[PDB]
Amino acid sequence: ISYTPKKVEGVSFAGRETPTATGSLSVVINAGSRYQPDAGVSHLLEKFAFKTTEERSALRITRESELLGGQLSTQITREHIILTARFLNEYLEYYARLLAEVVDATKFLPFQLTEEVLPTARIESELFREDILRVAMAKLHEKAFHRGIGNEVYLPASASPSISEIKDFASKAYVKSNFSVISSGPDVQKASDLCAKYFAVIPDGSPLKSAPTKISSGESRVYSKGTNYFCLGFPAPAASPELFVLSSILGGDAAVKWSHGNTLLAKAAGTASEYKATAVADLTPYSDASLLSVVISGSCPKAIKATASESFKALKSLSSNIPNDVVKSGIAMAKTKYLSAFEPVTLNAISASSLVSASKGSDAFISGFDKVTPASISKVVSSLLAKPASTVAVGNLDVLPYYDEL
């Protein structure tokens, strides 16, 4: 159920055996927006996936994959670049070869950047900028962390890196010591042998070095005419089961489909503004940091302000003592969410962090949920409220509150 790490021929491997008819192959390269030299280099390097290699052209890579009936996908986060390809289990060797060729020899033709790669990045950046909530969350991330993981993931409208910079970054990043291989087919030994045989020609460089994360605080404001948002942010140390339990105790999302909820945030909203503003919370683990955020949205700024004050009071109320039933409910919900975040074969923000970390990412993490006690949650909350939080306000700025008025 959980990936088991292994190392063959200097290649990091992590396999999983499932009873299905399909499979998956991915490479998790530590070359995300955290390590980029300039702005937007990681995005363009990721967009260069499955382009004209030294042995094949883009036409071949696309048309012949279509003939074989397979899907090729790419992904970019603030800390990773993921190249994946799902297929029927009968075509493992071909896709292993394709991924190895893409990683190793992916000759960067100067006229492809100005014809196929850059417009796609522009369109993706525009689509991201249209989404208000994603922009607000990115601004909160940038305000909380200084520059380590607080960079800008997508390409800004006023940047244009040369092909030489991308080629240099690719030559410095695509090395045998800077990624791993994730497979979840019905056979593991065969996939392991294939990956060991094929991913052994890339030169063995050295992992990229980045400074430890620097944590601070700050508040940003912006104007909008549509719906209004007010997001809180509490930077936290490396993720622990207590943090997941706290995030599930805060709650915000209903269990039953058409209902309100009995979590602290739901009750705060109900007793504050008669369910005219919704508050949800979630946790985003990282390599050496975490961010717990509370998002309050609605159309009435007065209701948003009132429910924000009520939710802050409710969160502050957790530092004294917690009844056992609340802890049990939070533990159950957190365990359910954490285990349900593993079913898809696509690597989300939770599974990738567990896989990259080699210190019992999932095998012992689940066992640590049942040992959470109210004292531990109280201590975590008390340590969380020492430094001030970071807020982002979107909409009418004369009613949306500051942090000092919460």
Next chain:
Amino acid sequence: ISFFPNKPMYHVQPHISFITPERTMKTIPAFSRWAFAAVAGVFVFAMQVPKVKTTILQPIAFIGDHFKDKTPEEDKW
């Protein structure tokens, strides 16, 4: 020695510009029908010409009676 070695069932046939024997074999009935229609139209647009009338239309039975002259001794001066 094969286009798409993993799938040897495929092959590439001679072609000029999307002109392939497989497509060429398909359009033959259309060409034949168009030729027949053109021939029929040319026939129908020229059926009062004296040479055609006396050579092709007249000898055919059950149709030559209508396509024959019916002038008695009162004829060309």
